[PDB]
Design a protein around this ligand. Structure first.
Ligand SMILES: OC[C@H]1NC[C@H](O)[C@@H](O)[C@@H]1O
Ligand SMILES: OC[C@H]1NC[C@H](O)[C@@H](O)[C@@H]1O
Ligand SMILES: [Mg+2]
Ligand SMILES: [Mg+2]
Lengths: 733, 733
């Protein structure tokens, strides 16, 4: 192959200093001042940059490469999680679209905008399975389901990379965080992960394998222990599974300071030993801590590592740079040398219409009493709450190069929608938290949350007056983006107390109460489900979020979002997830018993189940029909249902197919998602939906990690959520 | 062996109907009316009885055996968890004594009283490791620590069984629940258990192995899945581990309906298949569901099981009956019918003095502002709260044949202590819950909780009046015993809301506030720790609990209890446990950082850590001294410290020794308990404490379950709790 000969030929000319230099991944900042970094690039001591994100800045780095002996080009990476400049909903919101094409569009546009600024790589997609709502990084994933997350994992990779990694509108996908990062004990970030191999193989690993199989060029290794072994030192995970079993041929990248952290994990007593563990486990590239550059020469000289460990890692970095086209033209994403200067943040370089259309699809209607929604554009509308005018929160956590001043707030979305037809009245009502320590945490690094100097009582008095002067209240409440963020684990899943006090006070006005929720995690909403007139889940909906939200509230878009993560009744029920085991003593709702698996001091089950979301119309399903009672090995089974819009407005819903294996060599879940179809229907319109199932859909990992479909009964469920299904049985032969 | 020959010789004369009859374990109930059961005993269709617990009732069962062809004697079993008639503190409270001799005494007296009533066996000790306070069965274990629970597991078995299982003051120990029952996901009873084999072998399995190694005659198999396989169907657990690797020679007993529940777990489509899975996994004896008696003949006839499966199970039952002496004399625990009559419940048959002395040892002083405790016997003492006059709650869950009317309430204990020297003023103050649905749940089977018909406001008004004219308030608050019980999982770890409203109202009177907590699980006590003057944790202290509690409150006993389970600040922090891993990013208490493993919305770490407990005196430790800096393989290390009573009152504390292995092939806990010494000291008295460490204390299970000690540094910590330690290092060679 031309590639392996080109790289072998280059590596033949390289010193070990230069080979080791290729493994170093750094960003400009206090740890690495710009001038020292420029010198290191010229010395061949830098392989890649992260957090340098504009054409002039990236050109200036790539210009330093020209001064190096071998002129090996840099690659430039960034956290393009859910948009680059045009910010789409957070991934948890994108997942709620239940539309691979909507997700692909957000990823395609992200890659286009990032590559347009000179970037070659995103640290995305994040594909960690999340069953614990306390974890601040649940916003970054696709929810609790292995099938949906695996599917969207593949979609994100393919959308980012396109048909050619050398294309100037493509970037390389570095799938993260390999592995199991979202199972952190207590939902505390960075915390211990401990799980059985059958659960690991069946539920948590498939999304990373889906990204590898979609051709992801890079894998970012996680910060957590797996069964006592940090992923960064886990040769089983990075060599035996990722390379030998899965056949991954690309680049492994450490997370930030992950190699040095092997000391705190207690796998290493010093930096030299930590360095040896990471490179021999199969970590190619060393983020920020510089341990590889410091210790690899001494390890090699001493015979503590092999030349083959350095060569493997170096070949992987050069092979990434080759696939990205950077050996053909290191300026392929940076334009021509006499291109005129331009404003990186020009309105003309955004994709607002795409962001607005994508953002509409993820909004989930959780409650709508007496058809209060959609609203009429008339009278007086009170817009109340600390998130109503927040540009910083609507773009969410991991907002990349998104500019808060360019974002549309919920307030501005309503003003754009009503024009002169209605009067909008604003009141802040409350600070995002009443706890000064939480406000100081959120404002610790930068001013992220505006702290109103009024007393809580004064802000409430203004909100009650505003509400009393309106026909209805749109309360814009929930989390600031810093509350659903790396290292922001919550012990309380409710709306913050300052905002719940505001909601209780607004009920005293007797005005219809619409809640617009902004949040990066499932919330506990028992009070709200009892007391609010309508509830719209908007996650953090991005740059055009306010416009998409007004589109739903005024009925231009019929809410079509469905949850991809169960909403617990309280943090005391964590974890709750739809695909749980039956136990030997399941709750019997027809014959309730004390001696069943349940809590006695709270209603059982999630407040809102996986796949739940309402519409402004009604939908019906015909009885489920299977193509046969028996399925021969290697044949496919057809499951058929007719969906009807039995209401008065056009709208979409999601037909969900679930499977149960009720008798197996392992206890298998009560249901597992195995298919879905999002369908848009006119009033009175019907569509026949056909699902195809084969052996592949019936397999599970048994006690001995055999991936097998066992003969016997399977139950097929079809429904518009995980809770309201009809089922039919067949036998596998 | 005479034993093997006796059993072989009996089994030679037995039909398969009789062999199968030996496996049937039943109790009188709706499922098995007394007379049907008596007829079955006469027909040789019953192997053993549970929940028949008096000499006349057991004599009548054993009398029926005479009518059967082979006259094989029954054994009789019961849940003697923490006392038979004289009720000791719940196991969680017994553990807090940190005194193996106090635990052995409670077990010895339990076996004495149980055997005196005719019982041969207890379904005890319960030795499940518990890290999740939501689980209702936490009360039945010894807390979160593998070393302490394993130690006490051994102590309970040896105290029950004595030097001879045929002794009429001995019973057989059936250690439960094998295995991992207390790691239930969500702390929901009966729920999924999923963990790595290294965590399983290092932390959760050793207590069951400790009971096997102490010579436990029986093992009760748990109701939960382990990594997807119900324990009842788990051939790896019951045959490979328990029989071949651990060398257990005794009897395996299913939990209640566990065999039939294999259908609900989804391992079996029918009773016949469930029966086959349980007997071939290695379950000898079938509790209540009668599947063995129904299906084993058909399974054998059809060649679905071997004769060897029936013979193995039958030999194990006959071998237990042999060891219990029942073939020598089936009436050895039952005296003779012409014996002088006695009342089963006679005061003369109780052990009140032992119960009072044992109960003093487990009480944990959690707070004592400005030396409010101990109280003087003078003035006016308001005794307020729904647990003040509760006889049913002081004896706790699994109270066996304990008679509530024989128990000493906290109120009666204070009356007994003060005589005419002080005036006691009572007010109920609140019901145990303000939620009528929780009260109805607690009163579902029997009247367990007295519901005052007065409004919450009327009871508060009376309590405030009582408080107003007293010198101080002893608030007796917490859980009823039915809240910390099999199948009573909580989503809230606080004192119930009706009682917290009462505490806030009492705090507002400005009167000194002493909290006497009754509870079967760790509670979240943030408000109480901030606001109460003194807090005494009494668990459920048993038959003499009120007397032991008054002994501590008036200073006759200097509180010496220490926690064996971490108290979380809230249910949102679950799990918290002292022997956690460091992570790559631990909270730094000298330099707190956002990007650490923590919550942002609540103070971090437990409110009260493992090993915490105050005294009415103060104690000092001299610097820790190790016998050498290096330890040779097979040598023992000595760790020496001097403990002093530096205060004015005699009292006991517990010197705790912890070990850390800071560099290993797995990430190892920050600390692990490896020794302790409870020491009683006069004011100004000193004692030299010497701990011995060898290789056995330094070993751990690596990723491949190699059990060895790796050469390198170990850190030794000594202190009066897990949080406040001094450390010294040595090197293993
Ligand atoms: O920002 C770079 C890198 N740092 C930290 C995060 O854990 C990861 O998600 C991100 O890609
Ligand atoms: O009472 C019989 C048996 N049933 C249920 C419990 O799980 C166990 O602890 C007890 O021994
Ligand atoms: Mg099956
Ligand atoms: Mg070591």
């Amino acid at each position: 192959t031309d590639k392996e000969r080109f790289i072998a030929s280059l590596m033949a000319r390289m010193s070990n200093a230069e080979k080791i230099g290729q493994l170093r991944l750094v960003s400009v900042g206090a740890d690495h001042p710009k001038e020292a970094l420029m010198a290191d690039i010229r010395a061949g001591k830098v392989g890649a940059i992260f957090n340098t994100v504009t054409r002039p800045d990236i050109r200036a780095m790539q210009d330093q490469v020209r001064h190096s002996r071998l002129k090996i080009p840099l690659f430039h990476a960034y956290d393009v999680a859910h948009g680059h400049r045009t910010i789409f909903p957070i991934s948890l919101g994108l997942a709620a679209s239940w539309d691979p094409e909507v997700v692909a569009r957000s990823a395609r546009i992200s890659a286009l905008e990032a590559s347009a600024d000179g970037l070659d790589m995103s640290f995305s997609p994040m594909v960690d399975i999340t069953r614990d709502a306390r974890w601040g990084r649940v916003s970054e994933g696709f929810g609790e389901d292995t099938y949906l997350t695996s599917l969207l994992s593949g979609v994100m990779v393919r959308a980012y990379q396109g048909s050619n990694l050398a294309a100037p509108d493509s970037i390389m996908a570095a799938v993260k965080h390999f592995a199991l990062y979202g199972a952190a004990e207590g939902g505390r970030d960075y915390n211990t992960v401990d799980m059985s191999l059958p659960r690991m193989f069946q539920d948590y690993l498939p999304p990373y394998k889906a990204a590898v199989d979609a051709g992801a060029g890079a894998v970012m290794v996680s910060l957590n222990t797996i069964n006592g072994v940090p992923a960064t030192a886990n040769r089983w995970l990075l060599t035996d599974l990722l390379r030998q079993q899965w056949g991954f041929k690309g680049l492994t990248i450490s997370d930030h300071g992950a190699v040095k952290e092997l000391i705190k994990h207690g796998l290493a007593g010093n930096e030299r030993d930590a360095t040896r563990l990471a490179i021999q486990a199969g970590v190619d590239m060393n983020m920020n801590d510089d341990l590889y550059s410091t210790w690899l020469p001494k390890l090699l000289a001493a015979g503590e590592i092999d030349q083959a460990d350095i060569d493997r890692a170096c070949r992987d970095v050069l092979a990434a740079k080759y696939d990205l086209g950077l050996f053909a033209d290191p300026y392929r994403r940076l334009g021509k040398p006499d291109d005129p200067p331009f404003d990186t943040n020009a309105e003309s370089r955004l994709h607002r219409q795409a962001a607005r259309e994508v953002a509409r699809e993820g909004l989930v209607l959780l409650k709508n009493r007496d058809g209060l929604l959609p609203l009429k554009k008339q009278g007086r509308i009170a817009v109340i709450g600390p998130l109503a005018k927040s540009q910083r929160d609507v773009i969410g956590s991991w907002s990349a190069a998104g500019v808060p001043r360019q974002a549309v707030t919920v307030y501005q979305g309503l003003a754009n929608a009503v024009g002169e037809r209605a009067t909008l009245l604003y009141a802040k009502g409350a600070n995002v938290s009443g706890d000064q320590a939480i406000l100081d945490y959120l404002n610790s690094y930068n001013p992220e949350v505006e702290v109103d100097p009024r007393s809580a009582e004064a802000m409430l008095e203004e909100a009650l007056r505003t509400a009393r002067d309106a026909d209805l209240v749109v309360a814009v409440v929930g989390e600031s983006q810093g509350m659903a963020h790396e290292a922001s684990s919550r012990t309380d899943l409710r709306i913050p107390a300052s905002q719940r006090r505001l909601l209780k006070a607004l009920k005293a006005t007797g005005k219809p109460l619409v809640l617009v929720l902004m949040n990066g995690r499932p919330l506990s909403l028992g009070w709200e489900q009892e007391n609010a007139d309508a509830i719209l889940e908007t996650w953090f909906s991005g740059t055009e979020g306010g416009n998409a939200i007004a589109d739903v509230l005024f009925g231009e878009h019929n809410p079509s979002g469905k949850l991809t993560m169960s909403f617990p009744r309280s943090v005391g029920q964590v974890p709750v997830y739809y695909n749980h085991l039956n136990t030997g003593r399941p709750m019997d709702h027809d014959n309730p018993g004390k001696y069943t698996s349940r809590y006695f001091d709270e209603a059982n089950g999630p407040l809102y189940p996986f796949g739940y979301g309402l519409s402004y119309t009604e939908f019906s399903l015909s009885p489920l029909r299977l193509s046969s009672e028996r399925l021969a090995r290697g044949a496919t089974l057809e499951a058929r249902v007719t969906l009807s819009n039995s209401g008065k407005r056009a709208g979409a819903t999601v037909v969900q197919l679930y499977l149960q294996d009720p008798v197996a060599s392992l206890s298998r879940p009560v249901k597992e998602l195995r298919g879905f179809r999002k369908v848009m229907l006119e009033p009175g319109e019907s569509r026949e939906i056909v699902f195809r199932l084969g052996e592949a859909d019936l397999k599970f990992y048994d006690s001995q990690l055999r991936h097998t479909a066992e003969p016997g009964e399977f139950k097929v469920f079809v429904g518009l959520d995980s809770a309201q299904t009809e089922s039919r049985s067949f036998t596998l032969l």
